[PDB]
Amino acid sequence: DTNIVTLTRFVMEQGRKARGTGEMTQLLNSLCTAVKAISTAVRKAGIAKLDVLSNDLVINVLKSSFATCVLVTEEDKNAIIVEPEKRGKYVVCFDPLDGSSNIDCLVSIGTIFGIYRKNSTDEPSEKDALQPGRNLVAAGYALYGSATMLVLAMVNGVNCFMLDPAIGEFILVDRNVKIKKKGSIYSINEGYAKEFDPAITEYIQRKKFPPDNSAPYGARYVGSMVADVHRTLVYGGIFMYPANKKSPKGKLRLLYECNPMAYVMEKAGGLATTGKEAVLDIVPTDIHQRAPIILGSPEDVTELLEIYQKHA
Amino acid sequence: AFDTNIVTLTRFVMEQGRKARGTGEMTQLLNSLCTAVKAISTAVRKAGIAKLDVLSNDLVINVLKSSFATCVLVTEEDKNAIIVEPEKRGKYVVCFDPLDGSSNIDCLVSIGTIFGIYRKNSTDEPSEKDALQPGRNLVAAGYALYGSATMLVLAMVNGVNCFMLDPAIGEFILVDRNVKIKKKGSIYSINEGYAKEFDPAITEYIQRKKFPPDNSAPYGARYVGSMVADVHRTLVYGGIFMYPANKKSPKGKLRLLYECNPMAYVMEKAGGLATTGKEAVLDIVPTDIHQRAPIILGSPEDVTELLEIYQKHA
Amino acid sequence: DTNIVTLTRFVMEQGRKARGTGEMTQLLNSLCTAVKAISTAVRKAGIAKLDVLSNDLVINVLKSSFATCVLVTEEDKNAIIVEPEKRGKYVVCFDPLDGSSNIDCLVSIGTIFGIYRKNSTDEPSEKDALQPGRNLVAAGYALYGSATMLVLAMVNGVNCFMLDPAIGEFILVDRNVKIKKKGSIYSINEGYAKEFDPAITEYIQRKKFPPDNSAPYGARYVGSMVADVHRTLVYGGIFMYPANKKSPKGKLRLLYECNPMAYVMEKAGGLATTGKEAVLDIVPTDIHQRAPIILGSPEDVTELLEIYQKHA
Amino acid sequence: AFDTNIVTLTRFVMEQGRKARGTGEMTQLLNSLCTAVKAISTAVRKAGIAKLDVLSNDLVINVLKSSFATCVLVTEEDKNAIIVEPEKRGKYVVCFDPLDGSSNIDCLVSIGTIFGIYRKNSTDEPSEKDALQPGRNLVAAGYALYGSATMLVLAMVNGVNCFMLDPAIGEFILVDRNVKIKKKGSIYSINEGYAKEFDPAITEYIQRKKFPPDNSAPYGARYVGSMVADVHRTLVYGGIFMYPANKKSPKGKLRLLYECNPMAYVMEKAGGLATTGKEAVLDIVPTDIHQRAPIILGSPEDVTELLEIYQKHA
Ligand SMILES: O=P(O)(O)OC[C@@H]1O[C@H](COP(=O)(O)O)[C@@H](O)[C@@H]1O
Ligand SMILES: O=P(O)(O)OC[C@@H]1O[C@H](COP(=O)(O)O)[C@@H](O)[C@@H]1O
Ligand SMILES: O=P(O)(O)OC[C@@H]1O[C@H](COP(=O)(O)O)[C@@H](O)[C@@H]1O
Ligand SMILES: O=P(O)(O)OC[C@@H]1O[C@H](COP(=O)(O)O)[C@@H](O)[C@@H]1O
Ligand SMILES: [Mg+2]
């Protein structure tokens, strides 16, 4: 296409409307180099650990962007502070490859990222990262499956870009993704059925055997959060990884799995809660803390929230 | 970097047929299918920037006819069997589903091409009767998975070998030789949204997986919603995949000739079982080319565990 | 490679040292999208004019960069003035695909570009483009052959970047290309032998039948300027498209063939002359004017210049 | 977009051999060479980010042996002919230059793989004598050009057909069928740096091209410096390519079996001539596998014009 709207062109025209300095546009450009290199890695991870390579890649592209200052990783015990010479205004919380272990089974996987603005005047620190997802200025994920898709939520909307592997560019294919109000699928690991707390268990039963003599929901569960959430966004439904006695505080980490997705969901008109509060309004105390998460089409998450407080 | 001794699928099937006194035909047929799979991998990968199953159908059909190795072809997109024109005939029957789950591309779930090849057992004019052979008589069967990578998994008389598309040279490269499934698995795959209508055998097996009597950890649940996806997962990691019958689909959903039987043959050659609940899928005699069948496949002990539950429920 | 120096990372670190605004870095990034799309086009221009597509591509990526204001093309009669809303500080003179007609024969071909800074305060105009190549702030070419190579000359040096088609990125492979002083090849279309002016003709004879009983020069001539010049830069030699009675003012255009190459050559320690003056010191009056050009390793161009004024 | 009726090289050679009662061998051999060409195209394209001719040699040799279609192989990188082991033998002789002009990669000039395939004419044990056949006895011959695109040009008994690598599906696609060269050309290709030592026949032809007696426009000069480059140019656009002898290379530079003869056979099947100046290259009897020969090929009238100059100079 002769005037292809690339992710660069898209982000660039939006930063220009803020009368900014281009650090966002630098950032997402670097992150895109990481994403292409990792898609290429996963498309041949078989012909002859991987998440370590993936991680050193994302840190390097992000430091060299001259746009970050604190970086928090799935893979790193502490926050990494960008050297003064390369420091810039943003904080990035990211998981470089959620569920790497799934590549043997060829399950679609992805990089999840969340970006905050450091607001304080003192030295870069983990505190800058300990912010509520409600204050993210941008977020999204790149999914490596049949095709590589980068979905990006900013103040203006949720947009989806596809990698064109010929020209090595992410091209804009869906503008202002809005989720369906009510959907027909429920995504959850039912093999934890005995560990679930009452509200979930009533809702599972309500969807399988619908009290209103309507259609039972379809069950789906890829087993990798990006695959499941992306399907929930494009098709509608509910996705849950609730607390259970094995994972009492949930399992997905708040700063780099839950808050990114929750932000993408809510920006598309979806909702995202823990059962007791909005995921995005949780204030983190540890950069690696977990959350219960339930997200998806609005009426569905709500139906569940009623069962939660018709049980409180 | 740049390997000199590359084992491509063509080189490996060639080293099979040659020692068994091949004719050059299996390889002609298979190299044709590989072009079709490459061509479908790419369009799927650019799907959203560019029906795809109709085009796939036409493609798979044209590359197959041109192999000079086919005579009858069955497709899920074609009512009647296609009999290849005389000039291009050869001895095999290829039953195939060109693009499994094509509904799911929008949500970027891995989908696949499934195929079964029979050898014609008659001195006659090709007709769809030649396709109506049971699973046990398959010469080769396999699938192509369009996922984070493109995997072709061929199962033929000695075993199952996985291949992966090297997108640089455009070749399927041998990555796993002589595969064998785990014996006992830890994953069960079934659409529990249909839970209100399952037969009581299934209903107990699922609850046994969830709430184990003998205080084991429950089995995990996984269900991508694309048969190829869930089968490959079942083959590499083990477990059990169940698409049993429910009254709303009274004799199952999955079609016997080009979906159930290819998977059943790939499973059994890896040491798994594939049954409908009553009999081995591979011994059902096909009566209509688009006939349907319930299928349960997976790790031998898990299949068997569900069978004992079926036996005590009859 | 986990910390790949991409053309973006290279240009970005250099603009940062000027305390600039990033328009250069925007520019070369957009130009790179054009170059990848055209390499992809040429790598299948056969499976089933092209230079028209190539041109609309380069103009579009360049306007959307918010970094240009006058664009001069091989293919356009007049200079194109960037709309106010997308205007920026640079001028780009470019040939989107020198020798397109050579793709039938599979001769390596390329995009040549030259960038000036508009220095005046008045409205953008062709005058801003009518500058001497000596004042280019950057220049180079992308070559589409066996591999796609972008060679870029800036105030700091000549560097060569190769496109890695897996990750869709130009990677830095040669830093500070310096040309050889004296080389062993002479590149010229000898089928014009009767049309050549005396100095050339003495020099051709001196290289074939060397008076010092030394080795005769090897002749080479691909027939596409980028192929020939790139070889001259990497291997050393002399390349000439002199004036001849068919082409009395030369044939290559000054603003988008000769001045870019001349600038790349001189920045690598090469020289580039018309026989009477340095190509880069010529002051253009028409944006589509031609020049005689003779460029290559220094001692060789000089040897020829002595024959020119041992004939003046 | 996404074509359903893709004519790949495998499909086209298959439609040749089948009507002529093939054995499945030419196609086995050729599909092997295509993998080698794909693998060499990519490494060349990433050459500067990554000897390449040694690896190419090994690659071409392993893919060829595995075709079950070869018995003797001659390479410019190997002194003696390689005789394929018994298990993998078949009827053909492939003489090949794995990476012509590999010196030139640094300067990013298009280079190529050249190959000739003979059919063994003896009931004997394979030996390099089987390779010492003259050009006229070639069954198929061609080249692969690694340029702005990857072009494979196969010449076989009926004509020459160009194919182009579609980097998406990784297949060589038929783009020009039944090629024929122009009869009179306008380009002569020769390294005039060697001008001090050419034989007087050449010296007049070049001056006739430059300074035409009959007041035509002079011929243009073009010389890439890679034989494949200049040959393909000569085939598609016409003209004459001359690598004659000079005393400093007294019997020419280009080796007869795997460079001169493949080009000579591709030229003649397109209606061009290839001579040394005295005789047609295709009738010289090879005596050493690495023997050399002068070659002049190109458009029939231009070749002939230089020959009349050779006849009146003897
Ligand atoms: O191992 P990661 O990188 O944390 O990702 C795995 C995650 O963990 C979930 C699977 O957990 P269960 O098997 O407990 O459902 C996936 O859906 C998520 O991607
Ligand atoms: O209809 P298709 O193209 O066969 O794809 C969907 C199929 O239907 C199954 C899932 O259906 P449910 O939603 O009934 O589980 C998949 O395993 C199969 O691929
Ligand atoms: O047609 P373009 O795009 O101007 O490019 C052709 C140029 O013209 C030269 C060829 O001219 P001659 O055949 O006169 O040497 C090439 O070297 C140059 O690339
Ligand atoms: O030595 P190679 O690998 O055969 O490559 C260079 C060869 O040598 C010829 C050019 O040599 P000159 O410099 O003598 O013209 C080319 O046509 C041939 O490819
Ligand atoms: Mg994770």
Ligand SMILES: [Mg+2]
């Ligand atoms: Mg199907």
Ligand SMILES: [Mg+2]
């Ligand atoms: Mg030009």
Ligand SMILES: [Mg+2]
């Ligand atoms: Mg050679």
